[PDB]
Amino acid sequence: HKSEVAHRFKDLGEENFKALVLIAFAQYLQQCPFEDHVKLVNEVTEFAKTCVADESAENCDKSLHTLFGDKLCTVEMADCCAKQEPERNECFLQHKDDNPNLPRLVRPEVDVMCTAFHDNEETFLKKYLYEIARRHPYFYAPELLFFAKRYKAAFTECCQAADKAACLLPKLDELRDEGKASSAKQRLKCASLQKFGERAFKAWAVARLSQRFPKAEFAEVSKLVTDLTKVHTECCHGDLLECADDRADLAKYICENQDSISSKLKECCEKPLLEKSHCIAEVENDEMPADLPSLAADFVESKDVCKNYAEAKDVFLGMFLYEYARRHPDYSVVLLLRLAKTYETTLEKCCAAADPHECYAKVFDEFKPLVEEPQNLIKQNCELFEQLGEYKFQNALLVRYTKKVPQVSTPTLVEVSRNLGKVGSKCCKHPEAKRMPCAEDYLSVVLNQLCVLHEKTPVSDRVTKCCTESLVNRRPCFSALEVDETYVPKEFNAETFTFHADICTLSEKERQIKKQTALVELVKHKPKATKEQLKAVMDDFAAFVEKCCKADDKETCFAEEGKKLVAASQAA
Numbered sequence: 001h002k003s004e005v006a007h008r009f010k011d012l013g014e015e016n017f018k019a020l021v022l023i024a025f026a027q028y029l030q031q032c033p034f035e036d037h038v039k040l041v042n043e044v045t046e047f048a049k050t051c052v053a054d055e056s057a058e059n060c061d062k063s064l065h066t067l068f069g070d071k072l073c074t075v076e077m078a079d080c081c082a083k084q085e086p087e088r089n090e091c092f093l094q095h096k097d098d099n100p101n102l103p104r105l106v107r108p109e110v111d112v113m114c115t116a117f118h119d120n121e122e123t124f125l126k127k128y129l130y131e132i133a134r135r136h137p138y139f140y141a142p143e144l145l146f147f148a149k150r151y152k153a154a155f156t157e158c159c160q161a162a163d164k165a166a167c168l169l170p171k172l173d174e175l176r177d178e179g180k181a182s183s184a185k186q187r188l189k190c191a192s193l194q195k196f197g198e199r200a201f202k203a204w205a206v207a208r209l210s211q212r213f214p215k216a217e218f219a220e221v222s223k224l225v226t227d228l229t230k231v232h233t234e235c236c237h238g239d240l241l242e243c244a245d246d247r248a249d250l251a252k253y254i255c256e257n258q259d260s261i262s263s264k265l266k267e268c269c270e271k272p273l274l275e276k277s278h279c280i281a282e283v284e285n286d287e288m289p290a291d292l293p294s295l296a297a298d299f300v301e302s303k304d305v306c307k308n309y310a311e312a313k314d315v316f317l318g319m320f321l322y323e324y325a326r327r328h329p330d331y332s333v334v335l336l337l338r339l340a341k342t343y344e345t346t347l348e349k350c351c352a353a354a355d356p357h358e359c360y361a362k363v364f365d366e367f368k369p370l371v372e373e374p375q376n377l378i379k380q381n382c383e384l385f386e387q388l389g390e391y392k393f394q395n396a397l398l399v400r401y402t403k404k405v406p407q408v409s410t411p412t413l414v415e416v417s418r419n420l421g422k423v424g425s426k427c428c429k430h431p432e433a434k435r436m437p438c439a440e441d442y443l444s445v446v447l448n449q450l451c452v453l454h455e456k457t458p459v460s461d462r463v464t465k466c467c468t469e470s471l472v473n474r475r476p477c478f479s480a481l482e483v484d485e486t487y488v489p490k491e492f493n494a495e496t497f498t499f500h501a502d503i504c505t506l507s508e509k510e511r512q513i514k515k516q517t518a519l520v521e522l523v524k525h526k527p528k529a530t531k532e533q534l535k536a537v538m539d540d541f542a543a544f545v546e547k548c549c550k551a552d553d554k555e556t557c558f559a560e561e562g563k564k565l566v567a568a569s570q571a572a
């Protein structure tokens with residue numbers, strides 16, 4: 001590398017460069033309007049084109065953070081812009097806002113959108129990136145490019161359809177659902193790297209890829225872990241151009257040699273660049289090879305265990321996890337990492353003592369309770385889900401987690417508990433030998449969100465403990481939280497329980513959030529009421545809404561009949 005800017009302009013290409021730069025600025029300055037970033041991205045692009053012509057031109061020598069940050073600083077920001085590199089980039093990164101409280105964007109009419117798509121395609125698609133990047137500062141940048149590709153394809157197709165709204169809206173809504181999920185899933189990776197370190201990510205990545213590619217050798221898996229670690233490190237540090245290039249190259253590497261890795265990549269490697277990576281990242285598990293011995297020979301019984309461990313602890317323990325993860329796709333990543341830490345801690349205390357086998361021989365016995373514990377949670381909560389349904393299952397978990405940590409803000413409790421309820425719809429449909437991976441690694445994402453949303457405004461000593469103590473053990477920690485006894489009941493507030501005619505016109509998603517926001521506030525006001533008791537109060541609520549939405553005058557029904565609800569409720 002002689003001049004870093006131009007180099008990335010050739011590798012990635014103008015379309016992707018411009019995109020990735022727009023995403024970079026959007027994530028760092030989330031409050032600034034669209035027209036400002038467009039001007040900055042344009043000026044970097046035009047600048048990069050001079051460096052392509054001449055790598056010896058003025059300022060092309062500078063680093064990408066310097067080039068990016070100087071350009072943002074022509075525009076929170078005033079704090080960071082006082083600084084030099086690299087502390088400025090750390091500032092910018094610290095200043096990322098998870099819930100920026102931008103308005104949930106209202107979509108124009110489909111006829112209006114398809115006009116602007118044809119008349120100004122470049123603008124229309126640029127504004128998509130902008131708006132998603134702004135609300136999801138931790139979004140996997142190369143992924144978001146693929147989202148833009150899908151979003152583009154949607155209009156090319158549905159704008160030339162007989163019915164446009166019937167074509168377009170279910171595609172765009174489906175796409176927004178994936179976005180939120182991807183975003184949350186990626187927010188975990190960054191949190192893992194940034195709060196727990198590069199070992200956490202490396203250990204995570206060994207487990208996940210070993211499960212995925214069991215016919216791959218250890219040395220082959222360890223390479224893909226190094227490459228995948230680098231890619232997310234760079235993406236989570238704001239090196240978006242370098243992340244996307246390195247990710248692209250890890251995809252060409254894999255696809256070149258599927259034989260060394262897996263048999264499931266036949267279809268993925270016959271796809272466009274953006275879609276290619278997505279496919280690999282989300283590929284099914286390859287068939288575990290049949291001729292695999294017991295793990296106990298090399299790792300429990302052998303006479304050179306402490307010898308091979310002491311020679312290379314991270315090599316050896318990486319092999320353990322490799323060997324254990326490749327033959328247990330039924331286990332969750334985070335379950336596997338507990339066992340890798342259980343086996344780690346055994347070898348540290350016991351290689352020291354002069355009787356090594358006597359301790360080390362009965363290690364696998366320690367795993368038994370760690371494997372049953374998640375399986376018990378999934379069997380039980382999926383039972384509950386299948387019995388109630390998503391909405392009521394959310395309502396139950398809402399009561400559960402509010403009773404656990406009633407100090408947490410109501411938007412967070414409601415958003416988290418709602419997303420905890422979605423595990424049921426995602427994972428319980430699958431069979432028992434494929435449930436824990438789905439479920440427990442989803443809960444990792446959703447709990448990380450509680451942690452992240454809570455991190456900025458900490459009001460719960462329990463949530464801080466469970467979030468900080470161990471990345472791997474979080475779900476056990478949170479599950480183990482019994483109902484809080486210290487909590488003083490919050491005093492009745494008439495604004496919280498005064499509802500308006502607005503409720504009738506809303507969506508089914510939007511409607512039930514409001515009702516769930518009440519149910520938390522009920523649990524916050526009256527925490528000693530049972531799960532049965534509260535049902536009867538929310539019963540009367542729903543029927544009150546129902547009759548006032550069929551009213552001639554809706555305004556007056558919601559005001560007058562509403563106060564009789566709060567009177568009758570507060571009594572019981």
Ligand SMILES: [Zn+2]
Pocket residue numbers: 065089237238239
């Ligand atoms: Zn960086």
